């Protein structure tokens, strides 16, 4: 169905050093495919996916020259940010970028993305029209004034509508066999002893992709909230995700309580309860 | 393929 390509760039200024740490991470369908790191022994673009090895050495040299240029762009910009907010070079400062395009079900451009952030806060962001800019602080308005005069938005629009879409089309055709995958969650309810005549029923959800999931606990067809103890979706390590939802219930009436799991790539939401061995 | 930024901040 829908697809997306992203480039998550990071620049952490190092006090006492000329160049900052530049990390550019490429994504296709919220999954890593290319990565660059300045801290590496030989700083150049490396594939993070097995299907990405298909690209010749001409492509890697072309992308490394892009990162080497970007490494200096972020270096000068970080110094310009110090002047705007009146900060010191003796401290560490972070500058992040999120650029790319997300394609629809018909393999056509739905929206173009270009977002910037300084110190983990939104700095400047290119609007949906890819012609105007959104500036948060008065410091970001200086950047907006500079980029509107030089016509930076026009150059970003050319890539976001053209090159960004053009390259994603050939990336999907080079590895469609492993990209389009929706792992269904494996759910089971576990029994845990608690204080007095109360027990904790933990509804687990393991082995699912993507991380977008919902766990529900209900009594007599009524969803339980503010009493149900849930945990944040965590990665397993092999490429799949984990999540659980627990609720303190009295022993004997535990069969009345039912767990429901909501996830994509599932024909209908999974309904289950505790099984006594 | 990644994109190169034009003018600095």
């Amino acid at each position, epitope marked *: 169905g829908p697809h997306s390509m992203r480039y998550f760039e990071t620049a952490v200024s190092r006090p006492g*050093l000329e160049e900052p740490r530049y990390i550019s991470v490429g994504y296709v369908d919220n999954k890593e495919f290319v990565r660059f790191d300045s801290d590496a022994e030989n700083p150049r673009y490396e594939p993070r996916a097995p299907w990405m090895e298909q690209e010749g050495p001409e492509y890697w040299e072309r992308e490394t020259q892009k990162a080497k240029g970007q490494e200096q762009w972020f270096r*000068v910009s970080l110094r310009n940010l*110090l002047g705007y907010y009146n900060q010191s070079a003796g401290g560490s400062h972070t500058l992040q970028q999120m650029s790319g395009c997300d394609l629809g079900s018909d393999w056509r451009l739905l929206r173009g993305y270009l977002q910037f952030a300084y110190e983990g806060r939104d700095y400047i962001a290119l609007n949906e029209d890819l012609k105007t800019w959104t500036a948060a602080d008065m410091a970001a308005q200086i950047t907006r004034r500079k980029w509107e005069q030089s016509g930076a938005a026009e150059h970003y629009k050319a890539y976001l509508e053209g090159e960004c879409v053009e390259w994603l089309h050939r990336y999907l055709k080079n590895g469609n066999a492993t990209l389009l995958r929706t792992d269904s969650p494996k759910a089971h309810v576990t029994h845990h002893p608690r204080s007095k005549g109360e027990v904790t029923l933990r509804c687990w959800a393991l082995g699912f992709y993507p991380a977008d999931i919902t766990l529900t606990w209900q009594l007599n067809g009524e969803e339980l909230t503010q009493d149900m103890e849930l945990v944040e979706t965590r990665p397993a390590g092999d490429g799949t995700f984990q999540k659980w939802a627990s609720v303190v219930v009295p022993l004997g009436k535990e069969q009345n309580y039912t767990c429901r799991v909501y996830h994509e790539g599932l024909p209908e939401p999974l309904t289950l309860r505790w099984e006594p061995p | 393929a990644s994109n190169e930024n034009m003018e600095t901040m």
Partner: T-cell receptor
Framework: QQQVRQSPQSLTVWEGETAILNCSYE??????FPWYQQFPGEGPALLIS?????DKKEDGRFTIFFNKREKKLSLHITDSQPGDSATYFC????????????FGSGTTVSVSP | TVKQNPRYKLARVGKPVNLICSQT?????MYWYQKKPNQAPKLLLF???????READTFEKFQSSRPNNSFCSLYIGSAGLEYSAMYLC????????????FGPGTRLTVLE
């Protein structure tokens, strides 16, 4: 202020005499201090430079004496020649913006033959 | 080796001004300065490879373009009496402490 001060504005020294060209700064972040020399109808060219770690650097007649504690430096032309009669600029650079050179007002030396 | 022609430029108020600078040394950085009599050369803007950086206190006044590594130009939209100064063009093989090779400069005077 947060700038590079150069003194004197103009200097007249006799042929053979030692000409002292002073330069002061306030920012401790500055570590590279190059000197540029420009002749009439010509742009400034690198003459002699010095780093924060060194207190003295000699290149023939031209010598830079640097004091990190007092935040002051001076250019000395021990054997002045009428061919040295040019404008001298004292630049300062920090690790943060190594590409940028913060130049002083300048010193117009005039070696009287 | 850095070339700057013409040595002197004459322009009217409001009219656009364009100053070209040649290097032919394959240098990555090309700087642009403003020199007023008895004043320090103020950094206006610089071009590293194809990346442009303009100073926050002068970006509204000056614009720059670099088609190839050898040629870098300084553009003035609307000329005015405040622009009457010398414009020095420098070039360096890096974006750091290495030597800045300056050109002969261009003296510009703009009158009514």
């Amino acid at each position: 202020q947060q700038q590079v001060r150069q003194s004197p504005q103009s200097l007249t020294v006799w042929e053979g005499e030692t000409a002292i060209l002073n330069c002061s700064y306030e920012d401790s972040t500055f570590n590279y201090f190059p000197w540029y020399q420009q002749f009439p109808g010509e742009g400034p060219a690198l003459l002699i430079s010095i780093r924060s770690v060194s207190d003295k650097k000699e290149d023939g007649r031209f010598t830079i004496f640097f004091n990190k504690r007092e935040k002051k430096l001076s250019l000395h032309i021990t054997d002045s020649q009428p061919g040295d009669s040019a404008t001298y600029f004292c630049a300062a650079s920090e690790t943060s913006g190594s590409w940028q050179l913060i130049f002083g007002s300048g010193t117009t030396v005039s070696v009287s033959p | 080796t850095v070339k700057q022609n013409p040595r002197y430029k004459l322009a009217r108020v409001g009219k656009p001004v364009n100053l070209i600078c040649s290097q032919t040394m394959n240098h990555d950085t090309m700087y642009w300065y403003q020199k007023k009599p008895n004043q320090a050369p103020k950094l206006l803007l610089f071009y590293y490879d194809k990346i442009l950086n303009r100073e926050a206190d002068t970006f509204e006044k000056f614009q720059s373009s670099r088609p190839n590594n050898s040629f870098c130009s300084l553009y003035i939209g609307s000329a005015g009496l405040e622009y009457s100064a010398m414009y020095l063009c420098a070039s360096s093989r890096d974006l750091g402490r290495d030597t800045q090779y300056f050109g002969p400069g261009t003296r510009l005077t703009v009158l009514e």
